[PDB]
Every structure is written in structure tokens, then in C-alpha cells.
Amino acid sequence: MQEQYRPEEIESKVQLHWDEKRTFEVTEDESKEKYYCLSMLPYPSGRLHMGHVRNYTIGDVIARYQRMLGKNVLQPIGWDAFGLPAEGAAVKNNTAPAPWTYDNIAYMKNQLKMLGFGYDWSRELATCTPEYYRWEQKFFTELYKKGLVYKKTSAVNWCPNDQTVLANEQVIDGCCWRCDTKVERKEIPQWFIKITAYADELLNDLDKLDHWPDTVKTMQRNWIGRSEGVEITFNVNDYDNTLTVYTTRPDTFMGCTYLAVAAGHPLAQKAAENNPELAAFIDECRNTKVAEAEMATMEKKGVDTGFKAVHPLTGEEIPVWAANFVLMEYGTGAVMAVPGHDQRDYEFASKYGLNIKPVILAADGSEPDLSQQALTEKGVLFNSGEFNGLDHEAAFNAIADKLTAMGVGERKVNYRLRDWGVSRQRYWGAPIPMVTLEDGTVMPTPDDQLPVILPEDVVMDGITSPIKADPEWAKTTVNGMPALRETDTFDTFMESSWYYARYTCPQYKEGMLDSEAANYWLPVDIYIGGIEHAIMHLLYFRFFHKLMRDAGMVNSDEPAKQLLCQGMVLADAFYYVGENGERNWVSPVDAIVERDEKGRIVKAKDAAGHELVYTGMSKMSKSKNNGIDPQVMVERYGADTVRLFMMFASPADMTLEWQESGVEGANRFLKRVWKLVYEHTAKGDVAALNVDALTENQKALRRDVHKTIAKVTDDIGRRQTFNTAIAAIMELMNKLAKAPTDGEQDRALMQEALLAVVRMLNPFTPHICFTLWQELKGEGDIDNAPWPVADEKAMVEDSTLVVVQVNGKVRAKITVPVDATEEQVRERAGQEHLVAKYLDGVTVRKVIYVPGKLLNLVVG
RNA sequence: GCCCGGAUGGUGGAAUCGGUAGACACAAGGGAUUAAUCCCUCGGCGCGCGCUGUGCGGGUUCAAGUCCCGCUCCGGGUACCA
Ligand SMILES: CC[C@@H](C)[C@H](N)C(=O)NS(=O)(=O)NC[C@H]1O[C@@H](n2cnc3c(N)ncnc32)[C@H](O)[C@@H]1O
Ligand SMILES: CC[C@H](C)[C@H](N)C(=O)NS(=O)(=O)NC[C@H]1O[C@@H](n2cnc3c(N)ncnc32)[C@H](O)[C@@H]1O
Ligand SMILES: [Mg+2]
Ligand SMILES: [Zn+2]
DSSP: OOOOOOOOHHHHHHHHHHHTTTTTEEEEEEEEOOEEEEOOOOOOOOSSOOOHHHHHHHHHOOOOOOOOTEEEEEEOBBBBSSSSSHHHHHHTTTTHHHHHHHHHHHHHHHHHHHTTTOOOOOOOOBTTSSHHHHHHHHHHHHHHHHOOOOEEEEEEETTTTEEEOOOGGGGTTTTTTSSSOEEEEEEEEEEEEGGGGGGGHHHGGGGOOOOOOOHHHHHHHHHHHHEEEEEEEEBBOOOOSSSEEEEOGGGGGOOOEEEEEEESSSHHHHHTTTOHHHHHHHHGGGGGGGSSSHHSOOOOEEEEEEEEETTTOOEEEEEEETTTTTSSTTTTSSEEEEEGGGGGHHHHHHTTOOOOOOBOOOOOSSOOOSSOOOOOOOOOOOOGGGGOOOOOOHHHHHHHHHHHHHHHHHEEEEOOOOEEEEOOOOSSSBBOEEEEEEEEEEOOOOOOGGOOOOOOOOOOOOSOOHOOOOOOOOEEETTEEEEEEEEEEEEEEHHHTTHHTTTTTOOOOSSSSOOHHHHOSSSEEEEEEEEEGTTTHHHHHHHHHHHHHHSOOOOOSSEEEEEEEEEOOEEEEEEOOOOOSSSSEOTTTTTTEOHHHHHHHHEEEESSSSSEEEEEEEOOOOGGTTOTHHHHHHHOOOOHHHHHHHSSSSSSSSEEEEOOOEEEEEEEHHHHHHHHHHHHHHHHHHHHHOOTTTOOHHHHHHHHHHHHHHHHHHHHOOOOOOOOOOOOOHHHHHHHHOOOOOOOOOOHHHHHHHHHHHHHHTTTOHHHHHHHHHHHTTOGGGGOOOOOOOOOOGGSSSSEEEEEEETTTTEOOOOEEEEEEHHHHHHHHHHHHHHHHHHHHHHHHEEEEETTTEEEEEOO
16 A cells, blocks of 8 residues: 555556456345345447436445445446437448447446446346347237237428438427428327326326435326316317317316317318318428427417317307317317416417407406406306306316216316337337238237347448338248338337346346346335436336236336436537538537636637537537546546545535536545545554543544444435535544544544544445555455444533524524523523623513524514 | 426535524635645625625515525426437
């Protein structure tokens, strides 16, 4: 051990230790209690960024802490390796997605290793491999065979030029990411998994997820968006088909003054026939972007159809308008409009002069003033014929019952949640195991034809998928006849919905899951990953868990006991536009940046004097080229410093705007820790500690050493406030370094303190602590060292600090025996001159005493 | 737009259940050492004190960064980025 802390030496040596001793390789060890600490596996995008480091350090932190408490700890790592970015990337570069992907893996594999995370590499999987997706393929056919998979047509961002399907991110203000040719809606038959058939289970079970944050439970709930309502069926004049709407407000039904139908809706088609203006509007309507966000900011636009539904209850003819915000894919693609009592229908009616008919009384039972807006709050019906006077509830049911009994209504449950569309029209993904025969008929790819390999050796024209470009590939034989397999590939969310299970038995060819290894490790105890995935990935995750329950593969209803969603690590992002429309993102490292007085970026320019559009902080991603790769910091300072720096920035759950400034503290703290163990162990062995014997100065110290341990443990295991944990530790160092060390007892305290510290540090900076255990002649490898237990008896306070306020204003602070009465505290408070200052001429009206902590003298 | 969050010194942040605002650091300035270590200073405004101060506006309480009502700005998601 040198005097100078030189992580460039220590870190690899410790890592190489871990590789060889296979420290974090774990088996289904039935003696030791298991803990399965899972961080959401990365997509291999090229380089680690800081966001991943927050994730995996939080992850390594809890894993190592947990091993330290004596548990058998699974911490796995792998590559969620299908996805878009490799497609674009592999052409820029003239490769196939596969070799670019595998090389991204090796590069990053290397980055995660040097950061010393304690992963069970024996368990690494790469989702692009047939060893892997063959199982999601077989599973899908099981689901198919079991009625949970279907085909409906679905709108897709089609580029009319390229004539190629684009993901929303490749749509830039309504244009194509390559050439500024305009994206259009195309409906395309696609595969769906009836996630909706598990809506109630997904919705109800959240109330059992005691250890999932509320943010995520609430987000998922609002997303599933279950409602009870009524579908209502209307006849239209001179049209042969009925129209159906879903409303949660049948109560407002006598206030229906129009219907609005989707551009795609046959009424709209039939009416277009003879109405050039409607025909225009529908044609316009494939400029409606396949994202909800636009579907909602876009201005509502609609053309009347000339058609007239019959209100089943009033008999009045009502206009059918075609509108741009009502979609066929989702529900009936026909809504019922009550302008008086829905803000969306208030706006619409205003704009196009439709009727704004009131039918619900203000809370006071008076007629609502509609002249500005809808009355949306529920209430007594009026001007609703036979239903007048009824409260919201009774009107709901009353209108429900009549429409039911007229056979045109029905009570129906609905969910905002739509089914999951897994068909992707792209190459780099697992092919969907479906098969169309000469028959014309469609079945699962036969068992014995799984997996359906995605070939890796391809020429990528960029525009088309190799497996759609080549006529031979689709060709198979099924049931004896020629058939064509599906050329669409899976939404890559599919691979990230079940990896957590495959990690328990990645090397198992007999099935999807060696359910004995799955049930040894499952459910995951803690699941760590971005807040970004609160909803989609997590909801697919639970879903899939449950489909795997429902296949007898796993025992528990839910996949993850605890969920830790870290905040997003963000960074300034910047683009210029290429000579034809191409958005070019420019790393913040390369941006030359002019700053405000509130410190905001005001101008930005790239190395070539390109003006840049600054976009603000957004999560770090290769998409905006704004990720900071830990690599340089790591090689200058070592993993431990980057790691502790990351955990110290702020608490896990809070989003964090990245800044390079602050590292060195973390680095200097580690030098202070090093120096102090160096110096303390240079004076050799210590006497056993004699507890009853120590100066009060030593007694205070030990009690801090012990309160820290308690705090850091409570911070790490209950709150996940690693930053406070660390600060609490730092302050102990500051104390420890101002403590005497010639005393036999000085040295013995120092030594207990320093073991407790070096262990407390370990989950954050295990390389330096591994080394520092050895010096302190710690028992064995620090990795399996037990977490330190605070001794209650070393933690009793004699006194306690009481804050003193007059009329709520702190005037004084006063140490006071823990066992102090209000009256002694009062009299004590009194002795303080600044308290006296404020009590002259005034009466104590009210005294408030928070025992042992605070005294307020309401004075008048 | 909707849903979820967030906002605190020059900076990141602490304050755990309504009780001390700024713990712990970074930056900066000054000093002791001829890059490294160490001191001191450090929310504002006028002092071994007074007032003020937790994005903005109201409000409840003895007491509000925290709770309630209305907002602003920022981030995440919004179903094909992952
Ligand atoms: C008071 C009744 C009105 C608010 C409205 N006609 C209505 O029926 N509201 S609803 O909750 O019952 N609707 C159920 C679903 O239908 C869609 N929807 C109904 N009306 C509109 C509208 N004007 N614009 C966009 N979407 C609309 C909603 O997305 C909701 O998902
Ligand atoms: C199962 C997880 C996903 C489906 C996917 N593999 C994925 O998110 N892959 S990743 O490379 O983008 N990220 C892996 C983990 O890192 C977190 N993360 C990614 N980017 C950031 C960021 N800017 N700030 C904070 N955290 C971030 C992800 O949420 C995921 O936990
Ligand atoms: Mg600030
Ligand atoms: Zn194009």
C-alpha cells in the first residue's frame, strides 16, 4: 500500500480478483437467503453514458450492500440488443446491425467491467441471439393458441417516398428524418396481444405493490384508465348501419347535440362520396400523427357529413360531424358530443356553431352559465325530459336502464389502455412466428420451426428490410403445403418483458424457464431503472410476468417486490440541419455556448461555426448525441470516484441535470479516506477496545461512528438516499481526522471507526475499500464482510438540542438533558439573552413544546 | 393537451411524519506553504446585531421549503426511441 491513493493501480487488480474468484457468480444456493437485485439491462448503443452509471451504481450499491447482509445475491447484466438505432447506424457505417451490435456490446461490456459492478457475468445474455428469442417466439405462439393474440389494422407512419415505415422519432415536425418528404398515415394489418384482457389484474394489483413508489402506481393507473359507462347505439337517416358511442356521462345524454365520427368511419366514407369538402377533410386527416401528444395539441378540425343520427331518447335529428381527433382503431371511432358539459365539445361547438345545450344544474341547483365554458362538474339533470331532477348517479343509471331496455344501450367497462401492437416492419428484431399458407390461412410457425432465425449477414439498403427484400426467406412448408412466414419483427419491448426470468437460467435449452431456478430467485426483490419506463416497460413487464404465471412458469402474481425508479440524468442537447432537412445532433462537449444571467444557454455554435438549435436538458441518449461517457473520468480518477460522485449528486429518485463540476470533492474525499487508513495502520496493531474506560470525547466519537452506521443503513436500505448516506459518512471522516491517535484507546476507537467506515463505503467504492479492508487487516474479502451493526448502547444521548422561538422565530438554541421537563426548558430558554430581549413588555399567551426538540413562546 | 414529477446560495444538494433553512460538497475569494496538502471567508441587504430569504400569487397554523387553493418554468411519459 502506497501513501498516494492511485486507483489506476488498485482498480483493475481488484476487478481481476473478482473475475477469477468468480465473486459475484451465484447459483440457486438453497442454504443462503436469496436477493435478486435487478437493474434494467441496457440497449447496446455504443458507449455508456452517465444515466447508465447512475442505474448500475445504484444497482451495484444495493447488491453489494445486500451481499454484505448475508444474502445470496443475483445481480445480472445483458444486452437488450434489438432495436431501431442499429439500423440507421449500420448504414452510416456500412455494416449489418448484428456486427455493429456485437461490437457495441464488447465495448460497453468493457465499460461496465472497469466500473467494477458486481455482476454474475456467467449469466450474461444478448437478446438478439436465437438462444434467447426462440423462447419469446414459442411463447407468442402459445399466447396465439390461447386467444390472446390477434390482427387488426393499425395506423403507421408511412413515408410516401421511401415507401417505408417510420417510428415516431423518425418523424420530425411531420416530415421524414432522411428527406423532408411528408409522412402519411397508413393503416396496416398488425399483430396485437390482448394486454386489455389483463387490465383489471394490472390495475387492481397495484394496491398490493406496497414497495412500488406512488408516482409509478398512479401513472400506471391513469394510463390503464378504466371507466364504467354505456355504449349507445344510434340509427342514422339514409344510412343502413348503426353508429355506436362510448360515454362515461350517459347522465348528460339529453345534452347531445352532435356526434363526431372518425375520418375513417364508413359514414364519413359514404358521405364523402357526394361532398367534395368532406372528401378533402378526410384526405387531409392522414396527416394526423400517430402520437397522442399531437392528436391533442393539434387544432380540432371537422366537416359536417350532412348525415343525421336520431337521438334515441329525444328523437331529434342530430348532425354527424367527421372530426380529426376521433379514431377508428381505438373504440367505435364515433363519439357523442355534449358541449354544455365537456370542454373539448365546448370548443368544437363554439368554433363551428353547433348547439351548446345545458342539461346539468350548477352545484347550487341553478342553470349553468355556459357563455364562456362547459359545466363539467356533475349534478342534477334539467331540460332532460323524463330524467329532470335526478342526481348524477340516479340519472346515469336511469338513462342507462332506458337505453338498455330500448336495446340500444349497454353498460360497458372501458380502458384507456389499448392492446399491445408488437408488429414492427423492420429488420433488426425477432421475427414474428406466424405463417400464412397457400390455403390463405394463418397459423403459428410450427413448433419444430422455432426459432425462426433472423439472418445476420445482410446487405442493408436502409429503406427495406433484408428479410422482406429477399423473396426466398419467407418460404417455408407447413402442414405439407407452401407457406410464407411473417417478415415483420417484434416490438423490442418483447425481449425486455421477460429477460428478468431468463437471467435465472440463461443456459437452459429445454425450455423458456427452468422454473426451479426461476422460482428460487423470483420475484425480483428490487428492480432499478429509469423513471422513463414507469409505464410502458413496467406494464409489459408485469403483464408478461402474469402470462408466464398463467402458463405455470412462475409462482407469484407480481414480478418485482420493490421498484426503484431513478431520476433521468439529463444534458443540454443541440442540433443543426443538414443541407437537406437532416437533424444533426451535436454533443454538448463540442458546443460553444453563450450563457444568460439566470445561467441559461442563449446562443450555441458547433466547431464549424454552425448555428445550433439548443433543445434544453433532456435525458442523456445517443439519439441527441448528448450522453457523457464516464470513460474519461474513469481513467483519470477511477471507478470509485465516478461512482461515489454519481451517488452523491442527489438522491436516486430525483432527475439530475449533469455537470462535470463536483467530481473532485468525491475524489478528494477518497484521498482523505485513504490517507487516514494509511496513517492509522502505519502505527501497527491496536489493543482491543475497552468500552467502559473511554473519555467522553471518545464516547461522543464512538456514538457518532455508531449513529452514522445506523443512518447510512437506514438511508441505503429504506430510503435510498445514497447522497445523504454518503454525506453522513463524510462528516464522520471529518470528525475522525480531528480525533487523537496516540492513546491505546484512541487507536482502538479509530480502528473500529475505520472498519465501520471502509465497509460503509464499500457498496459505493468497493475497489478502494477492498484494498482498505486488507490494510485494516479486515477479516477476509470485504465483499463478504458483514454489514456493520450499530450498537444501541453506544448511541444513547445524554442531552438533546432544543430550539427556541418567540412567535415562531428562532432566538436561541440550548443543549438540555434528554430528560428535561417543559418547565426546565422554559426556565432554561429564559436564561438566554435574546429570548429575554423578546419577552420584555409582553405576556406569554401560549407555549408550545415539542419534547426534546423545540419550544415556541407565542407572545403578545 | 393529458398523466407524473421537479424548482432551495455562484453550483449540486440537506432538512426522514408540519418544527433550526442551506448539513455535506463543488466553485470563488483570502491566507500558510514554492502544481499537491492545509487554513479562513462565503444566501441577501444594512455586524459580538436587525431584517429578509426555499420558482410565482394567495391561504391555513404557534410554526410552512414541507400542508391547502390558483399559476410559472423545467424534465419524464404520452403507446413505433429505448
Ligand atoms: C360529457 C360527455 C363528453 C365529455 C364527451 N362527449 C364524452 O363522451 N366523454 S367521455 O369520457 O364519455 N368519452 C369517453 C372517451 O371518448 C373520447 N372522447 C369523447 N369526446 C371527445 C372529444 N370531444 N375529443 C376527443 N376525445 C373524445 C375520450 O378520449 C374518452 O377517451
Ligand atoms: C429494460 C430496459 C429498457 C427496455 C432498455 N434496455 C433501456 O432502457 N436501455 S438503456 O440503455 O437505454 N438504459 C438501460 C437503463 O439505463 C437507464 N437510463 C437510460 N438513459 C438514462 C438517462 N439519461 N438518465 C437516467 N437513466 C437512464 C434506463 O432507464 C434503463 O434503466
Ligand atoms: Mg438553485
Ligand atoms: Zn423518406
